[PDB]
């Protein structure tokens, strides 16, 4: 029986675990491991954390800045290009995903960091990881809101990025199965909010058309209309079956209501 880690420092907060996540035993067996929230170290006693702090000069993500809109930034981290920051975020991620895969060989990932900056720095909010190709079509592996930041909008903001990353390479992506609870959750209502207001404004447009307008596929279109019970079956087709008024009804639901922190695709400056 050797201790696990059960709580980390990161910044001003202090969090605790959910799940196991594989850091070297004489870093469980510590009471507390300290993060530095910039370089992401992770350390075994506060002497060495408050030594780190005086010292690191990183105040950022490294990577580069691909969004950026008032204090809102995205950085983008090349698995290849940042080994070690990119293994001791995934190392931290396991913490609270139950199910993510990998957090060694982190070569073929890019890793998508959320900010939320001020005078100090840019402070970590969230990411997403992505394999840099991916077969099965998956445009997020594993995906993750820091818990003090839950249930703010920066896990929709974070989902609808991964999309307008979708758009741009001009593909449709799903993210990686199994999701958390609140993955499930956060997924249906911002792929029900995309649609509704889509169906509300909308020449009529088929599934295909939506998937081509969206980046969502359409399992994704076709399962998210069923459970808002907006599509008909005609001989083994899905057809859209839209009342317009039952959409503003929709709409007026906190499930599917707008999240409050959007993507402007003006500030995303991405390429290939
Ligand atoms: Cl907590
Ligand atoms: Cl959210
Ligand atoms: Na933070
Ligand atoms: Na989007
Ligand atoms: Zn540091």
């Given at each position: 029986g050797s201790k696990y880690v059960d709580k980390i420092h990161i910044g001003n907060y202090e969090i605790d675990a959910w799940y196991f996540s594989p850091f070297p035993?004489?870093?469980?067996?510590?009471?507390?491991?300290?993060?530095?929230?910039?370089?992401?170290?992770?350390?075994?006693?506060?002497?060495?954390?408050?030594?780190?702090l005086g010292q690191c000069q990183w105040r950022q993500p490294p990577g580069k800045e691909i969004y950026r809109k008032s204090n809102i930034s995205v950085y983008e981290v090349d698995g290849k290009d940042h080994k070690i920051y990119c293994q001791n975020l995934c190392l931290l991620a396991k913490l609270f995903l139950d199910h993510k895969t990998l957090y060694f060989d982190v070569e073929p990932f890019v890793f998508y960091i959320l900010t939320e900056v001020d005078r100090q720095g840019a402070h970590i909010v969230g990411y997403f990881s992505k394999?840099?190709?991916?077969?099965?079509?998956?445009?997020?592996?594993?995906?993750?809101?820091?818990?003090?930041?839950?249930?703010?909008?920066?896990?929709?903001?974070?989902?609808?990025?991964?999309?307008?990353?979708?758009?741009?390479?001009?593909?449709?992506?799903?993210?990686?199965?199994?999701?958390?609870?609140?993955?499930?959750?956060?997924?249906?209502?911002?792929?029900?909010?995309?649609?509704?207001?889509?169906?509300?404004?909308?020449?009529?447009?088929?599934?295909?058309?939506?998937?081509?307008?969206?980046?969502?596929t359409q399992?994704?279109?076709?399962?998210?209309?069923?459970?808002?019970?907006?599509?008909?079956?005609?001989?083994?087709?899905?057809?859209?079956?839209?009342?317009?008024?039952?959409?503003?009804?929709?709409?007026?639901?906190?499930?599917?209501?707008?999240?409050?922190?959007?993507?402007?695709?003006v500030c995303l400056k991405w390429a290939p």
């Open positions: 035993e004489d870093y469980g067996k510590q009471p507390k491991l300290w993060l530095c929230e910039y370089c992401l170290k992770y350390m075994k006693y506060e002497k060495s954390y408050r030594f780190h394999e840099k190709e991916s077969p099965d079509g998956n445009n997020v592996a594993s995906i993750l809101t820091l818990p003090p930041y839950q249930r703010r909008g920066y896990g929709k903001f974070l989902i609808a990025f991964s999309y307008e990353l979708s758009k741009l390479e001009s593909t449709v992506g799903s993210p990686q199965k199994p999701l958390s609870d609140l993955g499930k959750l956060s997924y249906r209502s911002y792929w029900s909010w995309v649609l509704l207001e889509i169906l509300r404004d909308f020449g009529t447009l088929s599934i295909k058309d939506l998937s081509q307008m969206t980046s969502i399992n994704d279109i076709i399962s998210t209309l069923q459970s808002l019970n907006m599509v008909k079956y005609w001989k083994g087709q899905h057809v859209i079956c839209v009342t317009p008024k039952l959409v503003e009804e929709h709409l007026k639901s906190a499930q599917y209501k707008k999240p409050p922190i959007t993507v402007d695709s």
